[PDB]
Amino acid sequence: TKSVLFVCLGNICRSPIAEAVFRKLVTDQNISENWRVDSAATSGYEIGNPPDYRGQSCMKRHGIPMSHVARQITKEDFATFDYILCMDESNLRDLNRKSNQVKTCKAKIELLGSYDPQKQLIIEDPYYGNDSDFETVYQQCVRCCRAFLEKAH
16 A cells, blocks of 8 residues: 655645545545545644635635645654655755654655646745635646656656
8 A cells, every 4th residue: 555645834725735636536546545645734833723714615616525634744654654745845844854853764755846747846835825826736736646646756
């Protein structure tokens, strides 16, 4: 069984959308059973909270199921996940820092955007943005998750 953890700073705006998009893709391809899919935060700012309601509104428009309770990444996650796919370089710095504090790091840690055929490298925090910024995040997750599923690097 393969595993991927999507990560952003708070686990309310970006990573729950990536997770939900990816889970839908594998489910549509009859292989959800082969995959462990999750999302988590670098920080503890939003622990226990559901995804940003603007994100829920976006996913509803696109007919993508989403349900998550925000949680912080743990030391155990570096041992168990094949891939940790994050949103921006700040996430990446933080994840690399945490990963070096741990004995076992199975996970390949990289930017989700590094999979975008369109080379939109960074998935920017839409929290201080509007609905159009959530839509961009959504569209990025679609391209990136599809490409990741196709061929992980």
